[PDB]
Design a protein around this nucleic acid. Structure first.
Ligand SMILES: [Mg+2]
Ligand SMILES: [Mg+2]
Ligand SMILES: [Mg+2]
Ligand SMILES: [Mg+2]
Ligand SMILES: [Mg+2]
Ligand SMILES: [Zn+2]
Lengths: 114, 177, 79, 39
RNA sequence: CAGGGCUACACACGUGCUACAAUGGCGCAUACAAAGAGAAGCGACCUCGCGAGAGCAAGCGGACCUCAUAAAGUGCGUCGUAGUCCGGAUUGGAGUCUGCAACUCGACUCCAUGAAGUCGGAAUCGCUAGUAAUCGUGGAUCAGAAUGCCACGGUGAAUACG
RNA sequence: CCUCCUAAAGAGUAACGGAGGAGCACGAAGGUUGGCUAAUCCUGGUCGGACAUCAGGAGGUUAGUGCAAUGGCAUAAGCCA
RNA sequence: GGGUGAUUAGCUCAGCUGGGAGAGCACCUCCCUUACAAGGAGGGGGUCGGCGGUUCGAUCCCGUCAUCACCCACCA
């Protein structure tokens, strides 16, 4: 099952096995299995060519895994060439969405740099 | 045999009509294809190279060949004449088989693909490229991984210029941004 | 993400848009306001954003679609 | 040994490969999003 | 008067919040309160949007109407020990409503992302019965927010030789 | 004890003259047959880095010769089986 | 002049017969204390005086230069 990238998930319920691939999560998984008419309590055992390519076509109706990555990259390049406040915080590693820079921003700032 | 014959008719006539050479032996043909894997972190684990050689003899059909360390350097803490890396040379029928099973079924399983680069030629008509993952070849069971060991490919041809080699590979898919 | 149904723009900046477009590149454009949203008619303009004491000469590029003035001009000198 | 690869593009293609097993694929050289990807 | 700034950030400490999981998390069916607030206010009912919202207008100066069908709890089916369906930061996009105003700044829905964290060094805090702990809710501030303050309810322990 | 210069183009030639090494190693590093040709730089190439392993080009002994130096070595005295 | 040993974190020593830099005091951040010192937990700090070199590679191996310490400098 070389679908959507390198992931061959196995022995999972498909409702989580579709979250297992980058760029696709829970609600998208539920909608894909509804559009393919697949029960939630199935396993990846006994899977066929139809059960590959119907899933891949229904997810190829969606933005996945390569162009999403370079879309994030192109948004970041657009903000850096913009030189906005948010672009400056993206380029210098500071929390963008209205946080406090003073205390406890270590997800964005990394570990403590003395 | 397939892409060999595909060359033998279409690429021969295509390149000859492109560059209007004096003769057919003056056309670029692919001469050999070599494959390298630098196993260097096996300075301690002696069988890391042994299993990497099994991996390359699963990718290729033929048994590989180890490489001797040319001259000792302290920059990489190696001794001269050390079990240091493994290569496979390919000519002829297995070479065309490897190119077939490369360009059909391996390039699109590269992680998050976009087309290959342009300036990757030597200048005298050769090509080389390096991979990151290694289940891009089908001969690797996914439950057999033990490192993220990549490898690099060299297509050595008689292209008298890199632009001639570019037009040689434009007869193939050869993604080409 | 914001500004539901019709954005909010400025009176005097809106006037100075026509005061520069219909009357040529006289000067850089001087506003004490940092609010209005960039429309593609404004391409080719030197405007000024005041940061607390000082103006910055903002030029507008094509990909400034839903973007904002003070979003282009931060107001904190660092280090 | 010569095997047969087959992708989702309908491209049934027999090749020599040392897998020792028949093959299922999606993307071939035919019908891959390369030119649509560049666009 | 306009605008920037207490919301900056090489770092330490205090107060707190959410988890690190299986007594847990999920999905479905599911029964049991209190004190509150309300007129420039609360907002049932229906229709569209998966949803956060929009229109209509009943009633209520109030034990009648609104906030509103609270949650752990019980049965079933589940994931069977992993950074896992645990956890939710950070970030891209698309939204909604508020308010002249959301860049310096918010609140929420969704799509996708899934870092460290597998029980915490020396030290340190509370607590004698419906409390310790855990789970919800209401108010005041306000035009908009709570993990903060004030108040209420559900379940509900251990130990005291000294 | 070995090597160069001082040694004046045969040999040799002193000084508390100027500069260096040896008191070992090898069962292959020896014999033979068949065979190969290095250093350094540039380019391209995943981790990979000024420099590991791959391919090509310039170059053509600057490299190697168990070790100090000198002589010599391509018919190789260097390297592989 | 001449024979012997030494230059290392802020301070003081072992690391030199060749391939990872250790010990003690100090420094910095926490902790108990009304507050220091002592005490308990946790970190980083050198490019081994300098110039050249041999070797794949030097704190270590070799030749000078600056400084320090020691011993000699007798017959007259
Ligand atoms: Mg008491
Ligand atoms: Mg509190
Ligand atoms: Mg003579
Ligand atoms: Mg003579
Ligand atoms: Mg011979
Ligand atoms: Zn295909």
């Amino acid at each position: 099952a070389r679908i959507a990238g390198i992931n061959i998930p196995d022995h999972k319920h498909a409702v989580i096995a579709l979250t297992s691939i980058y760029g696709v999560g829970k609600t998208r998984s539920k909608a894909i299995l509804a559009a393919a008419g697949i029960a939630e309590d199935v396993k990846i055992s006994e899977l066929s060519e139809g059960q590959i390519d119907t899933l891949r076509d229904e997810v190829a109706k969606f933005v996945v895994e390569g162009d999403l990555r370079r879309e994030i990259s192109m948004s970041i390049k657009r903000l850096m060439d913009l030189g906005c406040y948010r672009g400056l915080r993206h380029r210098r590693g500071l929390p963008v969405r209205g946080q406090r820079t003073k205390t406890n921003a270590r997800t964005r700032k990394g570990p403590r740099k003395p | 045999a397939k892409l060999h014959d595909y060359y033998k008719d279409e690429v021969v006539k295509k390149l000859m009509t492109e560059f209007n050479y004096n003769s057919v032996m003056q056309v670029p043909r692919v001469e050999k294809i070599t494959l390298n894997m630098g196993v260097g972190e096996a300075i301690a684990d002696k069988k890391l190279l042994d299993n990497a050689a099994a991996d390359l003899a699963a990718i290729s059909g033929q048994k590989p060949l180890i490489t001797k360390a040319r001259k000792s350097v302290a920059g990489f803490k190696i001794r001269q004449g050390y079990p240091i890396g493994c290569k496979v040379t390919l000519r002829g029928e297995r070479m065309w088989e490897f190119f077939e099973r490369l360009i059909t079924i391996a390039v699109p399983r590269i992680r998050d693909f976009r087309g290959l680069s342009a300036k990757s030629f030597d200048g005298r008509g050769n090509y080389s490229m390096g991979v990151r993952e290694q289940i891009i070849f089908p001969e690797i069971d996914y439950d057999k991984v033990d490192r993220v060991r990549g490898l690099d490919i060299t297509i050595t041809t008689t292209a008298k210029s890199d632009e001639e080699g570019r037009a040689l590979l434009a007869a193939f898919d050869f993604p080409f941004r | 993400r914001s500004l539901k149904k019709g954005p909010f723009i400025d009176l005097h900046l809106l006037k100075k848009v026509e005061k520069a477009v219909e009357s040529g590149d006289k000067k850089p454009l001087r506003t004490w306001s940092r609010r209005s949203t960039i429309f593609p008619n404004m391409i080719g303009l030197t405007i000024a954003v005041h940061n607390g004491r000082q103006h910055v000469p903002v030029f507008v590029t094509d990909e400034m679609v839903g973007h904002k003035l003070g979003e282009f001009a931060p107001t904190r000198t660092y280090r | 040994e010569e095997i047969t690869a087959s992708c989702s593009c309908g491209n049934v293609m027999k090749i020599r490969s040392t897998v020792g097993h028949d093959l299922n694929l999606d993307v071939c050289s035919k019908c891959h999003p390369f030119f649509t990807g560049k666009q």
